[PDB]
Symmetry: D2
Subunit: 130 residues, 4 copies
Amino acid sequence: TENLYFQSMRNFERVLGKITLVSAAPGKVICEMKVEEEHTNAIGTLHGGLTATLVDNISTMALLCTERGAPGVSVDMNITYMSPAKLGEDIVITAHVLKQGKTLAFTSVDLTNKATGKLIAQGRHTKHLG
Amino acid sequence: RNFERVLGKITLVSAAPGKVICEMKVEEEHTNAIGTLHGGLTATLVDNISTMALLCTERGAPGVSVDMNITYMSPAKLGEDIVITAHVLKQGKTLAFTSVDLTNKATGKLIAQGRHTKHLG
Amino acid sequence: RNFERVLGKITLVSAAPGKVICEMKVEEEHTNAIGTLHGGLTATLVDNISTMALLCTERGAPGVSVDMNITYMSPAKLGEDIVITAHVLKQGKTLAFTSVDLTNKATGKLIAQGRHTKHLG
Amino acid sequence: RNFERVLGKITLVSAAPGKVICEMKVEEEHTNAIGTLHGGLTATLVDNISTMALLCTERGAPGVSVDMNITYMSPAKLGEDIVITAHVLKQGKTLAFTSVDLTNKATGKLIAQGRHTKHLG
């Protein structure tokens, strides 16, 4: 539903470009993006580092959608890469808040190929609140 | 043009077999909403410089990412000079394992450390 | 005899394509100094249940562990009944990837979540 | 009595600020079915020695595991002597960071590397 325009940003979050926010519920966010040149590596696949940026941004969004408003600072992120996404493809980014304590929040993120429903990558992301 | 453009301002200071050191000044385009080195760019740095260390080996094969983790220990503020140093830990016929430290150039203190497993060939 | 003796008390609930469920009661033998499920036993569980999940396919090849990560979200105390659920995320020719959730049997609440990559052949 | 019984055979070699060194000979007790160091024990060793390195600072606080990762690079065969070297990467206000390298004593080749984040109080 909502278009989001990170391209208007001047800091690093600008690398996401045009993403659409599909839904945002308590502790769950779904976004999509078409993979564009700006997102790719030389081989024309979603760049490992944009994947991480998505894991970082989209999980933060899910924590913004919590009863506590706080984005937190990263402590530990991990990502497993499973299949490539190609220039021109739509990916969907699904972030879940697994647990939110008073000091720590834990999130998970799947990127899936929208066409095949197959996971591109899964990230877990621990953040320190306050 | 593509995502590699975001590394444009890094300078490679040293490369040696299985080991590479780069430096970079943290500028606005590198920052998150709060003015420190974006976590996403730290992972890009981990990915690219680690890959550079692998390329700097006899078999100069870059591999494709399988597993990456990063632990964030201290923030790197806008205008700080960071040092990124990447080491090949082991390189097999199929799998290579690399580690990467990001340090604050002025203090010597770790910003973040990453390990990055890659699949070769 | 060997190290899997530590798994003597885990009950296998079901193995199915892409998913394995075990359960256990944490006894003293399973705990740390603070009387909660020892983090190393959790890691052992993840390693084990995910390898079991890999076997559930025609290529019932166990593979060698490459990278595991575990995030510990809440303690599993002594006397608690716990569920351990491996899912297979992807099984390729050379690499297989699995996720493992440890949950409280009573509440469903998440104790820990692991991901585990293995190198097949 | 509890899970640490499995570390009965580790020897403490030295405990210095920021660095603990331990050793063990890997016995059948410690192996998997392939007769190599069990990946679950390896993870136990990371969790435990890393905690030791913490416990040997002015704040002798063990903390609770938050995130742990391990990458396995070579097997430690039965009858091999191995070294577990934990390093304190940072001790902050509520979060402490540790690294752990398992090596072959004779050759010094990396068996496995872990990082471990613990939460203090």
